[PDB]
Symmetry: C5
Subunit: 206 residues, 5 copies
């Protein structure tokens, strides 16, 4: 533990936290979604509730070390409060997102950070058709709330959402789940910005 | 990262935070509303629930910098915790407002701040008749909870609430939505305060 | 801005916080209620929900200054966390009081503090009869939770609850609403204690 | 104001917080309940909700002073955050307990602390028979969550719950309410630990 | 109080907290569930709610002391904020776990830590057949959220869940409940990680054994 204590001390107390990207030094965050459950549907308010975890990855030079200097430690875990995290938000949620896992991130000696918050989200979705063979499709965009595409880029590794942890006895069966990067335009600043649109097609289990 | 670290350190550690406006140095805050959804109506309690974000803009001399001394940085993002923010509140909500976005603001080199919190609001609104062609009208005033018109002025860039992100499959269709500055006076004091009145006319969604 | 900064540092950093009143320096807090809505009634649990705001006022010598020493500043606003505030509570609430306003106070150069929290309160109230012409009466006492009448006195400017912001399209119509100082007793110390009794008579709107 | 600030500084700043009891110095905590309302009953989940305040009392040498050194102050009120408080918990609650009053304690010159939190509690209770002349009985134990009887003893000043603030128009009428110290032994350890059993027999109001 | 204050000062104020385990100093955490109640079942959303506490136990050399040097104190209690705690999470919860107990741990002189948080948990469970004789079975896996099997091992003291504080008048009777260590592997990555699988077989209560 002494070497990990040194490393954490060297990375966190010896300088300020990363202040976020800039135009001069923009940042790529990769996202993927792992969908666990569609919990419920409210046809009186057109809200659907999802449970998923969201893998976020990025890389900072300020978080690199040489494993040789610290007992060959090649990665560690630390509170998400110790580091900068991207301001990724659901654009059409109808309640504050609920946090379902520990807010802890993994940091690798090359400066890669992996943060995988599990979340319960209520979002804008009209579920009319869900009690049918064809089912229903809803979507919700994830984006940095404040950064433009000059500062933050969002990427995915695959446009296919991971269903390997989807609850087999959910009330709702998944027919398709995609995560698609998109470039939007903001009129206020004239600048592009990026979202990942999560689109889920689902039906009441037969 | 270096220059941005320096800028933030210079602005936030090398002085205390803006203490808010006074009568000798008043402040103008511009507001506008981007209405996203009428989620829910409750005809048993006369409460309606709205999702929207609120664009807030103000300018402070103490937040200005010369980009040439900071690697040509012209703006940055920072947590709303690092700066003063106006105490704007819905005057007729029935629940604590829920925050739906990161509490982060954009600060520009001229000292302009833009802060755009997304919110869910339950407020006082009689939905009797919302299942009709004419729909219903409800209104909610936004104001500083503690500052009068001698310290804080509120204004809008437009009268029209922005409906470009309004949810197309909401249970409720928006018929109109306006945001209007009003000058009020508190009880018998004759002392002025300003609000922005959010008036929304809507009906149950509907040939189709 | 700098004069206000100086004032606040002089008041808050150069002395600790007011420790609360004592038998020998008791404090008077004036309360007034501004009723906004009876939001709902639950006849199966005998709980009624009110929205109001609560004007609180008190005066401390430690918060006085001379406006001429501070660029003619006569009043300022500050976070209620920066100052002492009285522990006024509804004695028969059935849920934690929910806060509907910014927790900021107004301080005037004579040492007067005004704090006006808005609140949603569930409290004990049998609404049986609300659907008639005569209506129903319910009441709730507000008091310091830990101070006696020897440390904290409560007073009202007026017996009449202010209804100038009562919602005109409330499900419930206010027939009368008073706020009346009362003196109480308690055999655990014998000391008197003060409450403001909010008495509201209402019915379903016609 | 000044004597009180000096006293509070002497007690809280000049020394750290009481760290809790030990086998060598055990601590007796007295409890007493003041039952305000049975707010509701859920027969589909066997949960009942009570509102009450719970008087907690203990005594620490470290909180003593001589009134003559502090201008004859014989007591004061302070934030419960300033002092150690016992970790008493309802052992069969079904929801986190909701705090209904300011978390402020009374400290006396002899080192006695009195802390009286108002609370709403959902707990495990089968209300079958509540609508009958006999009514129903439910119980919940209150105990230290982490201390044995070697460190903490609990007791009551009376075995009768105080009903003098019980809500007179509650849906539920109280037939008896008792509070009784009990000595338990953990599994096969022989190690004692104490609880106060709150037993309430109630029925639907005639 | 003085001997305890010294002890706490020497353990917490002279060094930082345990930073967690690493591949070269891995940690074993022991978990035990004490099931108190199945509070409700929601057949419209396939969520069930449990009340339980969860005994967690682990041992750190950095929290050891000689009782001789501290007035024979052999253990103490302290706020869970003062120490490292393991990031154990239920993997199929559908709401944030609700905390029902004070967040305080017990630390012994050998450097053992025992933290027993009382919880209400909603989790993914299809209750279809819960009204029958044989009832229904649901499962929830508990695991470190960020550590793999190279840094954290989880085990149980025994496979039977402790039912000695299960509510005698719950709406639901427990037919069995077990807590079993499992080895998983993440995706195709080949890399192990451990869970404790909480498996509860339950039915709506009926008086008598229900099969006669
Ligand atoms: O600086 C802003 C302000 C505004 O905030 C409301 C939310 C918005 C949704 N996304 C999030 C990032 C944002 C954007 C793009 C490019 C530069 C700045 C920037 N934002 C927000 C903006 C809109 C549009 C866009
Ligand atoms: O006298 C008051 C108290 C009252 O407090 C509740 C909140 C209010 C919102 N704003 C903040 C300042 C205030 C106002 C304006 C002019 C003189 C007095 C005065 N205040 C508050 C008042 C209302 C209205 C207004
Ligand atoms: O010191 C106390 C403790 C006790 O706390 C439970 C609630 C109570 C209701 N009111 C609030 C103030 C109080 C009171 C009156 C006179 C001196 C001290 C004092 N309090 C509380 C008391 C009871 C009674 C009373
Ligand atoms: O060994 C234990 C663990 C168990 O933890 C859950 C909470 C409990 C409440 N109190 C706190 C101390 C305890 C107890 C008493 C005597 C020896 C061991 C012991 N504890 C906890 C125990 C229960 C019961 C009791
Ligand atoms: O690659 C990952 C990411 C993923 O993150 C979500 C949470 C998980 C719970 N534990 C924590 C460590 C982890 C794991 C084990 C072995 C290799 C990679 C790996 N992780 C996480 C993983 C799951 C599963 C497992
Ligand atoms: C940034 O600022 C410098 C000097 O302050 C100026 O010469 C130029 O316009 C900008 N960028 C450079 C030189 O990269
Ligand atoms: C304050 O009032 C004085 C006269 O009483 C006046 O000369 C001056 O303009 C005011 N000062 C400030 C700083 O506003
Ligand atoms: C305090 O008590 C002393 C001793 O009985 C008494 O003489 C004096 O009147 C009191 N002092 C103050 C400052 O109130
Ligand atoms: C602790 O134990 C020692 C050695 O067994 C014994 O001599 C003594 O009585 C105890 N010391 C204290 C300080 O209580
Ligand atoms: Na959002
Ligand atoms: Na989880
Ligand atoms: Na408000
Ligand atoms: Na508990
Ligand atoms: Na209260």
């Amino acid at each position: 533990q002494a070497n990990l204590m040194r490393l954490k001390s060297d990375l966190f107390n010896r300088s300020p936290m990363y202040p976020g990207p800039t135009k001069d030094d923009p940042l790529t965050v990769t996202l993927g979604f792992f969908l666990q459950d569609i919990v419920k549907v409210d046809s009186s308010t057109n809200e659907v509730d999802l449970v998923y975890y969201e893998r976020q990855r990025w890389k900072l030079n300020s978080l690199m070390w040489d494993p040789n200097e610290y007992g060959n430690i090649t990665d560690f875990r630390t509170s998400a409060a110790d580091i900068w995290t991207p301001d990724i938000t659901a654009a059409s949620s109808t309640r504050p997102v609920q946090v379902l896992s520990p807010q802890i991130a993994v940091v690798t000696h090359d400066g890669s950070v992996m943060f995988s918050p599990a979340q319960r989200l209520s979002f804008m979705c009209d579920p009319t058709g869900v009690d049918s063979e064809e089912g229903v499709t809803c979507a919700v965009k994830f984006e940095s709330w404040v950064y433009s595409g000059f500062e933050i880029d969002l990427k995915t590794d695959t446009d296919q959402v991971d269903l390997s942890s989807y609850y087999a006895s959910s009330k709702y069966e998944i027919l398709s789940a995609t995560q698609t990067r998109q470039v939007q335009h903001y009129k206020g600043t004239g600048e592009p910005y990026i979202d990942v649109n999560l689109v889920v097609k689902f039906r009441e289990r037969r």
